[PDB]
């Protein structure tokens, strides 16, 4: 509500409250496989070796 109680007479409509422009989140996950093993760079579609 915002119409209750009138202090003392004059009151305003809904949506008169300032808020905070930013975005946040409580958690993410755990992540580890993307920074463990080495990368092997390869130009071609496939590679062979003996």
């Amino acid at each position: 509500a915002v119409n209750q109680s009138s202090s003392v007479e004059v009151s305003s409509e809904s949506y008169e409250t300032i808020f905070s422009q930013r975005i946040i989140r409580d958690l993410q996950k755990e992540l580890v496989v993307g920074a463990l093993f080495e990368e092997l760079p390869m130009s071609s579609k496939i590679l062979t070796m003996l």
């Binding site: 509500a1 209750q4 109680s5 009138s6 202090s7």
Partner: protein, 50 residues
């Protein structure tokens, strides 16, 4: 010895004007304690013949 303090209520917020319904802020009762004191005593005597 003062009383304990204190259980205070929360204002429901649909009214205004003081108008505030605070349960009465009762000042309890100031109290004391009587420190009673007793007497202890003893006697003894002797004789010339002992």
């Amino acid at each position: 010895v003062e009383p304990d303090a204190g259980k205070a209520t929360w204002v429901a917020a649909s009214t205004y004007g003081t108008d505030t319904t605070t349960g009465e802020e009762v000042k309890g009762a100031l109290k004391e304690i009587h420190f009673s004191t007793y007497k202890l005593a003893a006697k003894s005597f002797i004789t010339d013949e002992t």
